Every structure is written in structure tokens, then in C-alpha cells.
Amino acid sequence: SKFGAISSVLNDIFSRLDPPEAEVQIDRLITGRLQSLQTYVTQQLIRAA
Amino acid sequence: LCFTNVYADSFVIRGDEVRQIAPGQTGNIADYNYKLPDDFTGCVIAWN
């Protein structure tokens, strides 16, 4: 998932953006993937119960 | 505000080349003559 970023491949955004602009999109990707992992952990906790 | 230390750097560059004076930029000035930290905190002041 892109999570609003220009691309979901980190090397791509690193190459086609400057660090000041790449930082925001990398933050968006980090937040999206962290939220996905949090949701996975919560679902696993419910299934474990 | 208050600051523990202040460093004043100065130099002369092309008018259209001031774009290169910024954090994490790439180019002749940004790479081989004067490079700022990516997390640089401060102010850049230029005039003709």
C-alpha cells in the first residue's frame, strides 16, 4: 500500500525526492506499516484469547 | 529564544545558486564546497 506516498518502494522515493520532501512520504509509509502491524498484533491477541 | 552557541558562516555564490544552500541538497556547492546537515537548525540569509 502507498499510504498516500508517491510510491511504495522506498528506494524509488529516495531517488526521485530530496531528503526534505522524502521525509514526509517516508513518515507516511512508516505510520501506515506500523498501524498495519499494530492491527495484526491486536487481531492475534483476540485470536489468542 | 536562547542558544548555547551560534556560528556565522559567510561566502559569495551565484544568484541562482543560492538554492543549493539548504539541508540535504545536492550539487556543486551542496557537495564540494559547503554542505549543511540534513537536520540543520538555523537561518540562511542572502542578498544581491
Coordinates of C-alpha atoms in Angstrom, one line a residue:
Chain A
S1 CA 0.0 0.0 0.0
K2 CA 1.2 3.5 -0.9
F3 CA -0.5 5.2 2.2
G4 CA -0.6 8.4 0.2
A5 CA 3.0 8.4 -0.8
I6 CA 4.2 8.8 -4.4
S7 CA 5.5 5.2 -4.4
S8 CA 5.6 2.3 -2.0
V9 CA 9.2 1.4 -2.9
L10 CA 11.5 3.3 -0.5
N11 CA 14.5 3.4 -2.9
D12 CA 12.2 5.0 -5.6
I13 CA 11.1 7.8 -3.3
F14 CA 14.7 8.2 -2.1
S15 CA 15.9 8.6 -5.7
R16 CA 13.2 10.8 -7.0
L17 CA 12.8 13.2 -4.0
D18 CA 15.1 15.3 -1.9
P19 CA 15.5 14.4 1.8
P20 CA 13.3 17.3 3.0
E21 CA 10.5 16.1 0.8
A22 CA 11.2 12.4 1.0
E23 CA 11.0 12.6 4.8
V24 CA 7.2 13.3 4.8
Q25 CA 6.4 10.4 2.5
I26 CA 8.7 8.1 4.4
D27 CA 6.9 9.2 7.6
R28 CA 3.6 8.4 5.9
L29 CA 4.8 4.9 4.9
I30 CA 6.2 4.3 8.4
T31 CA 2.9 5.2 10.0
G32 CA 1.0 3.0 7.6
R33 CA 3.1 0.0 8.1
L34 CA 3.3 0.5 11.9
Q35 CA -0.5 0.8 12.0
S36 CA -0.8 -2.4 9.9
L37 CA 1.5 -4.3 12.3
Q38 CA -0.5 -2.9 15.3
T39 CA -3.7 -4.2 13.8
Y40 CA -2.1 -7.6 13.2
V41 CA -1.0 -7.8 16.8
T42 CA -4.4 -6.8 18.1
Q43 CA -6.1 -9.4 15.9
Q44 CA -3.6 -12.0 17.0
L45 CA -4.3 -11.1 20.6
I46 CA -8.1 -11.6 20.1
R47 CA -7.5 -14.9 18.3
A48 CA -5.2 -16.0 21.1
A49 CA -7.9 -15.2 23.7
Chain B
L1 CA 14.9 32.2 22.2
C2 CA 18.3 31.2 23.7
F3 CA 21.1 29.3 22.1
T4 CA 24.1 27.5 23.6
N5 CA 26.3 28.6 20.6
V6 CA 26.0 30.4 17.3
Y7 CA 28.2 30.0 14.2
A8 CA 28.1 32.6 11.5
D9 CA 29.3 31.3 8.1
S10 CA 29.6 33.6 5.1
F11 CA 30.6 33.3 1.4
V12 CA 29.8 34.6 -2.1
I13 CA 27.9 32.5 -4.6
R14 CA 25.8 32.9 -7.8
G15 CA 22.4 34.4 -7.5
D16 CA 20.6 31.3 -8.9
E17 CA 23.0 29.1 -6.9
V18 CA 21.6 30.1 -3.5
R19 CA 19.0 27.3 -4.0
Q20 CA 21.8 24.8 -3.2
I21 CA 22.3 26.3 0.3
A22 CA 19.8 24.2 2.2
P23 CA 19.8 20.9 4.2
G24 CA 20.4 17.7 2.3
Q25 CA 20.7 19.3 -1.1
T26 CA 22.9 18.0 -3.9
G27 CA 25.1 19.9 -6.4
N28 CA 28.4 21.7 -6.7
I29 CA 28.1 23.9 -3.7
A30 CA 26.0 21.4 -1.7
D31 CA 28.6 18.7 -2.2
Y32 CA 32.1 20.0 -2.8
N33 CA 32.2 23.5 -1.1
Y34 CA 29.6 23.8 1.6
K35 CA 27.1 21.2 2.8
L36 CA 24.6 21.7 5.6
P37 CA 23.4 18.9 7.9
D38 CA 20.1 17.3 7.0
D39 CA 18.7 18.2 10.4
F40 CA 20.3 21.6 10.2
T41 CA 18.8 24.2 12.5
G42 CA 19.4 27.9 11.8
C43 CA 18.8 30.6 9.2
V44 CA 20.1 31.3 5.7
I45 CA 20.3 34.9 4.7
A46 CA 21.3 36.1 1.2
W47 CA 21.1 39.3 -0.8
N48 CA 22.5 40.6 -4.1

